[PDB]
Amino acid sequence: SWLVANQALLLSYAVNIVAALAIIIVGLIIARMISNAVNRLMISRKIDATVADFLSALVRYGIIAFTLIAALGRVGVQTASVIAVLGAAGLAVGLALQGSLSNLAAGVLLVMFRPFRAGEYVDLGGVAGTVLSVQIFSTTMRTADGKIIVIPNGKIIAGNIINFSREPVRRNEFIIGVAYDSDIDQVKQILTNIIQSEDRILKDREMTVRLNELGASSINFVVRVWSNSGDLQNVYWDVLERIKREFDAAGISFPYPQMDVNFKRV
Amino acid sequence: SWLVANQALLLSYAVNIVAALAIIIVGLIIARMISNAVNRLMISRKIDATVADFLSALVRYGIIAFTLIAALGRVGVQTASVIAVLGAAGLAVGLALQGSLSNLAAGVLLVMFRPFRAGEYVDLGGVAGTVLSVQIFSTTMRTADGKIIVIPNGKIIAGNIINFSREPVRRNEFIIGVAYDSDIDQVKQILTNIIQSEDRILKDREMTVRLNELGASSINFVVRVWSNSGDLQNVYWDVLERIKREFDAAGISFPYPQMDVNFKRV
Amino acid sequence: SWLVANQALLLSYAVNIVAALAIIIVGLIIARMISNAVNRLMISRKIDATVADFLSALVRYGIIAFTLIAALGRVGVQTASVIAVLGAAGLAVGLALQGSLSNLAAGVLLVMFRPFRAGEYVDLGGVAGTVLSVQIFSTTMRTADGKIIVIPNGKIIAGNIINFSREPVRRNEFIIGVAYDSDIDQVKQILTNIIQSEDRILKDREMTVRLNELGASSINFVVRVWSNSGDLQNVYWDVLERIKREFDAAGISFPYPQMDVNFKRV
Amino acid sequence: SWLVANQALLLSYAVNIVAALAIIIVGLIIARMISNAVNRLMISRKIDATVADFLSALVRYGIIAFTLIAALGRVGVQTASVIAVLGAAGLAVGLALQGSLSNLAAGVLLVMFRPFRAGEYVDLGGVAGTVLSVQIFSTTMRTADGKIIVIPNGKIIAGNIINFSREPVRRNEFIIGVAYDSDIDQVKQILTNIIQSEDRILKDREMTVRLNELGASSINFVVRVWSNSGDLQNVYWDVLERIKREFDAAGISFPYPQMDVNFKRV
Amino acid sequence: SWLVANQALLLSYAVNIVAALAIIIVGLIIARMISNAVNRLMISRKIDATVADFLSALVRYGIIAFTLIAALGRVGVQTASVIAVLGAAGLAVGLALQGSLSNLAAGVLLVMFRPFRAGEYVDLGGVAGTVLSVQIFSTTMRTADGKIIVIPNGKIIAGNIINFSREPVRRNEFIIGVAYDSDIDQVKQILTNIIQSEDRILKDREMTVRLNELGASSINFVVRVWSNSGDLQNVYWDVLERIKREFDAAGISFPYPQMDVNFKRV
Amino acid sequence: SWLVANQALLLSYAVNIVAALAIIIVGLIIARMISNAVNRLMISRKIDATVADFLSALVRYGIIAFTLIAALGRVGVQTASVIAVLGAAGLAVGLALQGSLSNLAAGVLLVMFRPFRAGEYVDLGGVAGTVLSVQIFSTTMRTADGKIIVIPNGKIIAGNIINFSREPVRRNEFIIGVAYDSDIDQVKQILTNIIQSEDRILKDREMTVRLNELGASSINFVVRVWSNSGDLQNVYWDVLERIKREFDAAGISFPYPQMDVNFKRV
Amino acid sequence: SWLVANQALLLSYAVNIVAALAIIIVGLIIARMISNAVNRLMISRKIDATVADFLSALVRYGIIAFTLIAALGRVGVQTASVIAVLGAAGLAVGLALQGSLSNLAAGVLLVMFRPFRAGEYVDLGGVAGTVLSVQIFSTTMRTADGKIIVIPNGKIIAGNIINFSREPVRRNEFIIGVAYDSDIDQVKQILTNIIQSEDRILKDREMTVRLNELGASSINFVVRVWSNSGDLQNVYWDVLERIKREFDAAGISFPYPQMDVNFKRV
C-alpha cells in the first residue's frame, strides 16, 4: 500500500513526464514554424534547389535534435555523452570551414581598407593586371594578355601587394653594351644629348649616365630616368630606337659575344 | 531491524534499479528499431556491402554505447571518465576527416558561385583543359592531349583560377629576331603591311610594332594584336608563315647565333 | 555517546563503502570476462603475438582503470584531476594517430568512388604504372620498368589523379627541325602525304601540319594526330621512321647546331 | 484536490515563469538600448554602411541570443547542448581570425620596439626601398624604381630585417680580371695609387688590394674600401671609371673569354 | 552558547577534517608503496640512472600531487583553478610528444603489414639499400656504398615505398646514338642479332629495337629487354661491351658533338 | 495573503538582490582602484600613449566584465553561455600571440645557455657576421659589409648555429689546376717547399699535398693546412700569391679551357 | 525583528566569511613560505639574476592568484569566468613552449637509444663532422674544416641519420674516361694489374672493373673496391696517382672535350 502513501512521489514523476511530452510537442510545432519561416526569409537571395533547400532541411534536423536532447535530459537520462559527441562533430566541421572563413575575413578587411582600388593596375604575387571588381570570397582581375584570373582573398592578403597606379611617377632603366676600344667620353656625351632631347622626361628629377660594371665580353652602361606612368612604356621604345640610330651614326659598334683562342696544331 | 525502518531507502534504490533495467531494455529495442530503419532509408542510394552495411553496424554500436553509458550513470557510477575518453576519440576522428570535409565545403562554394562553367577551357594551377563536370568531392576535366585529370575541389579553390573562355577577345604576341645590319624602317614597314592585310585582327584595338630590346646575337622586334578567342590559334600560324615568306622576299636575313673570335697562333 | 545517536550517519557511510568494494570486485570479474571475450573474438583475424596480444592487455588495463577511478569517486575523493590527466593523454594519442586515420578515411573514399579502377594505367603524382589492387591503408601499383611501388592512400587523394585508360582515344605530337633554306611548301606536302598514308589515325578528328615556331638554329614544324590508346605508341615509332626515310629521299636535310663566326687575325 | 494542497508548488513554478518572461522583456529593452548606444559611439570613426552597420546588427543578434539561452535555462530546459554548439562556432571563427590577429600583434610589437624608423632605407625579405609609414595591419614602403609595395606586418617580423640606414658607414667591394701574362706587382701598385688618390674613402679603416682567386680564363683581384653610406654609390662609379682609364694607360689588357684548341684534320 | 546547540555542525566539519588528514596520510603511504613497486617492475628492462630513475621520481610527484589536490577539495576549497592549470600543462606536454608518438604508431603499422621484409633491397625516398632490421621508433638499412642509415618510421610511411626485391623480374633500357649518315636497317639488324645471342634475356617477354627520337647532334636508338633481377646488372654491362665491339666491327661510327659553322672573314 | 506567509522567501530573494548590487558597486570601486594602481606601477618602464595607456584601459574593461558576469550569476541567470563565448575569444587571442611568445621563449633559452657569446663571429642560417647584443624578442648582429641585420630569436634556434670564434684553430683548403703534360712529382715538390717555408702554419697538425681528382680540361691538386683563426685569411692570400710566382718561375703552366676539334671541309 | 529569528542564517554567513579571510591569510603565509623554500632549493643549479630570480617571483604570483580565486569562490561569487580566462592563457603558453619541449623530448630519446655515440664521424642532414657531446636541448659537433656547429635535437631526429663510423668497412668508387680508339681489353688489363698490386684492398670482397656507360665525348670505366674505413681516403689518392702514371706509360691518352665541325665557307 506504498502507492497511496507515495502519491506525492507519483505527482513528481508524472509532472516531469507530461512536461517532457509537452516539450517534445511544442518543439515539434516550433520546428515546423521555424522551417517555414526560414524559407520565407531565404527566398529573397538567389536560391539553388540542390543546396539552398538542403540547408533549410539541415536547420529542421538541428532544431529537432536540440529539442530531443533536452527532452531526454528532462526524462532523467544523462545526456552528457550525446553532448560530447555533438561537440566533437561541431568542432570538426568548424575546422573544415576555417579555410573558407579565412577568405571571407580577409575580403572584409581588404574592402574596408582598400589597399588597391578597382580599375587599377596592380600585381598580387606575380600576376600583373587590372582589377575589375572585388567580391566576398574572391577577387577578379584581368591580365594584359586578356586572360581572366580569379584569386582568393585570403591568399593575396598574406602576400605582398604592389600598386603601380597609386604612384603618379615612376622610374625607368636602360642597360647598354659597347666595345672596350670605344671611348668612354664620346658615348657618355651622345647618351646625354639623347636623353636631353626628349621632352617626356622630368629634368628636375635625377638623371644617371654612368659606367655601372665591366662585363667580360663588353662594358655596360646604365641609364636611369623618371617619367609619368602613362607615357613610360612609349618613352622606353622611342629612346631605344633613337639610341640604335645614333650609335651607328656616331661610329660606335655594338658587341657580339667575344672569344679569344690560343691556337696550336698537333 | 533497520530494514523495516528504512523501507523508504529501499524504495528509492529499487526504483532506480528497475528504471535502469528498463532503460537498458527500451534502449535495446530502440536500437533494433533504429538499425532496421536506417537500412530501410539507406537502400535508396548506391550501396556497397563492404562499407555501407558496415556503417549501419557502426550506428547500432554507437546507440547501444550511448544507452549503456546513460544506464551506468543511472546506477550511480561516475561516468565522467568514459565521457572523457569518448570525447577524445571523437575529436581525433573529426581531425582525421577534416581533410575530406574541406574538399566537400569547397565543392559547395564552387557550385553555388560558379567561377567556371562546365564545358569551358580553363587552367587550375598548370593543367589546361576543358571541364566536363563538377562533383561533390572532386572535379573532372579533359586535357588537350586527351588525358583525363581528376583534381580535388579543396585544392583548386586555394590556387588561382584562370578562365580563358569567359573573356571573348584575347591578345597575341610575336617575337622576331633580325640582323643588326638590316634597316629598322624597312622591317617595320613590312610588318605593318602584313598585319594590316589580315582580316581576323581588330583594327579598333591597339596594334604594336616596335623594337622592344637589343639582343646580343641580334635585335628583337615585338608584335601585338587582338583577335577573337576562337580564331586566335589559327591567326598565329598564318601570320608566322606569311612573315617567313615576306622576309626572304624582302632580302632581310634571319640571324644565326653569332660569335666573334680574336685569333692568334702560338 | 554520539555513535548511538548517529547510527544513521554510520549507515550512510557504510553502504557507500560496501558499494565501493562491490564495484571494485564486480569490475574485476567484469574485466576478466571482457579480457577472455575479446580474445575469443580476436582470434578470427590474423594475429601477431608481439602486438595483437599486447593490445588485449591494453584493454584489460583500460577497463580496470575506469572502474578504479569510478570507485575512487564512490569513496568520496575528487577525481576531476585524474580525469583531466587522462583526457590530456587521450588527446595526445589521438593527435598521434591522426595521420594514419587520414590514410584510412581517404582509402574509404577512393574505394566507394572508384576514381581509378584496378588494372588501369594511371599516374598518381609522377609515378606512371598499372594498378594491381587497392587496400585499406595503402595502394599498390606496378611501374613500366617492373618495379613495385606502394603509396599511401592519404597522399594520392590530395594530389592530382591522371587516368590514361579511362579515355579511349588520345592525341600525339611530333616536333621536327629543318634548315631555313628548305622550302616550306615541299615539306608540308611531304608530311601530309605521310600522315595520310597511315591507317591507324583518325581522319574525322583534327590533323595539324604547320610551322609552330622559328628556332635560332633551325625552324620547327609541329604535327598532331589522334589515335586509339592501345596503338598510340606503335604509331609514333612507325611515323618517325617513315619521316626519316622520306626526308632523305626528298632531298631535305636535317639541321646540326648552327654557328656563325666573324673571324679576324691579330 | 491536490491543487489546494500544492499551492506552494504552484507558487514555485509561477514565480519562475514570470521571472523568465521578465528576463525576456528586460533583455529585449536592454538589447534595443545597447544597439542604439553602440551606434552612438561607433559614428566617431570612419563607417561603411555595407560592413559597419552590419556589425552593429550582429551585436543585436548576439545579445538577444544570450538572453534567450539564459531564459530557456530559467524555464528549466537543459541548455548545455546549445552552449556546446555555440562554443564550437566561436572556436571556429576565432581560428579563422587568427591570421589577421597575428598581423595586428606583430604591428604592435614593431611599433613599440621600432626596429626600423620611418623614412629609412631598408629591405624586408628581398624588397629594398624606403619606408613611408607604419600602420596597424600592414606596412607601406616605396621601391627605388618608384613602385609602391604593401607588406603585412606579420610576414616581415618572421623574416630577417636589414637596416642600411642605421649604420653610418658601409663597405664596398670591387672584383677585377686581368691576363695571366700581366705582372702582379705593377697592377697592385696601380690600384693602390688609384684608391689612395680618392678622398671619400676612410684611410683609418682597412684597405685591401690582393689576389683573391685564380679564374680559369683569367686571374681575379679583389678590392675593399669603406666610405660613408650617402657617397658610397658615387664612389663605386668614379673608381670604376678611373680604373678603366688607368689600365689602358698602363698597358694592362682586360681579358676576353679564353679558349685553347688542339687542332687536327681528318 | 551556540556551541552546545551546534554540536552537529561541529561533528560535520570535524569528520571532514579528519577524513582529509586521513586521505593525506593514506595517499602518502600509497605513494611510497607505488614508488617502490614501480622500481621493482622497472628493473627488468634496460635502465639508465640519469633518465629511468628520474621518471620514477616523476611518478612519485604526480601521485602526491593528485592526492593533494583531492585533499584540498575535501577541505572545501575550490580546486577548479588548479585543475585548469594542470590540464593546460598536460595538453602542452601531449602536443610536444605528438611527434615521437607518430613515429611509434607508424612503426606499429609497418610491423603488422610488412610492406617490405627484412633483408630486401628497397628505396625509401631516394636512399637505396638493403634493410637490416625494423625497430619501434626507427628503421635501419645499409646502403650499397656501405654507409649505415637510420630513418624514422613516421617519415617513411608518408613517402612512397619502392620494393625492387618483391618483383622477381625487371626490365632494362639502353639508349644509343649514331650518325645520321648511317643506315637505319643495318643498325637495327645488328642490335637484333646481339640481343638474340644473349641467353639471360626472356624471349617470351617483349623486346624493343626502334628509333625513339631524333637528337640534334645525332639520332637515338632505344632498346628494352626483360631479365631476372639478380642477373640484371651483369646483363647491362655485357650487352654494352658487345655493342661497342660490334659497331666498330660493322663500320658504324659513334657521334661526337656536332657543330656547323658559317665562316666569313672581316 | 501568501506574502505574509512567505516572508522567508522574500528574505531569501532580497538578500541575494542587495548582495548582487553590493558586488556591482564594490567591483566598480575595485576597478577604479586597480586602474589607478596599474598606471602607478606602469610608469616605471618606457610608456607609449597610443599603446601603453590603451592596455590599462583594456584591463579596466576586463575587470568590470568579470565582475558583471559574476553579478549576473548572483542574480540567478545562467552565465554558461557568456563564459563559453569569452573562452572562445581567449583561445583565439592566445593562438594569435603564440608566434611572438615562441620568440620570447627561445630568447630566454638562448640567454641562459649562451650558445654564442656577444662579439663573436657566427652565422645563423646563411648570414655571417659579428653579434652585437641579444634582446628579448630579437637578436642583433652586424655583417662584414657593414649592414645591420635583425633576426627573431625563434627563427634562429630552429636552424643550425655555427660559431667560428668558439674554435681557436681552423683549417684551410686550396685547389689548383695544371696541365696534363706537367710532371706530378715536380709540382708536388714545389708545393711542399712553399707550404714548408710559411711560419703561420701548424707543422704538428696534418698537411696534405695530393692529386684529388682528374678534371676534363686539367688535373686538380688539393692542399690543406691548419692555422690560427685570426691569421687564416692573410695566410690564404699570401700562399696564393707565392704559388703564382713559383709556378711561372718553375716552368709549369696554368691551363686554359681545353677544346679538341675534328675538322673536315664540306 | 528578523535578526533574532535568523541567528542561524547569520551564523552560516559569518563562518563562511571568517573562513574566507582565514584562507586568504593562510595562503599568504603559505606563499611566503613556498617562495623562500623554492629559492633555498634553486640555488643549487647555476642561477641567473635576470631570469632565475624572475621565475621564483612568477611562482609567488601564481600561488597567490590560485588562493585568491579560491577565496572568491568561498565568498560566493561565480569564478567560472576567471577560470576560463586563466585556462585560455595556460593553453596559449603551452602552445608557445611546445617547440622547445619537442627538442627536449627528442634529446631524451636520442640519449637513451644512442643512435650515434660521441666521438663518431656522422652526418645529420648535410653537415658532416665528428660529434663532441650531447646535451639536453641541443647537440654539438665539429666539422672537418674545424668550424663548430650546434644543431637542435628535435631537428635531427626527424631527418635521416648517417653513421660512417658504425660500419667497419666501406666501399670506394672511381670513374675514368678514355678515348674511343683505345682498346678495351688493354685498359681492363692495366686496371686489374693496378688494383691487384695494392694491399689495403679486400680481395675476398667484390672487385669490379667494367665499362659502365658510353659518354658522348669519351667512354667511361667504373672501378669499385672495398677497404677499411680508416685507410679509405689514402687508398683513393694513391690509386688515382698510380693510374695517371700507368696510363701515360701504357700509351693510352686521356680525353679532352670533343667537338666535330662541318665547315663551309660563304
Residue numbers in the entry:
A (entry chain F), B (entry chain G), C (entry chain A), D (entry chain E), E (entry chain B), F (entry chain D), ...: 15 to 280
Show sentences the authors wrote.
In prokaryotes, MscL and MscS are the foundational members of two structurally distinct classes of MS channels. Sensitive to tension changes in the plane of the bilayer, they play a key role in the response to osmotic challenges and remain a de facto standard in the search for the molecular principles underlying membrane force transduction. The E. coli MscS crystal structure in detergent revealed a homoheptamer with three TM segments (TM1, TM2 and TM3a/b) and a large cytoplasmic C-terminal domain cradling a water-filled internal cavity.
What is the EM structure of MscS in DDM and what is its micelle placement? We believe the pore and hook lipids were carried over from the cell membrane during purification and reconstitution, as we find evidence of similarly placed density in our DDM MscS map.
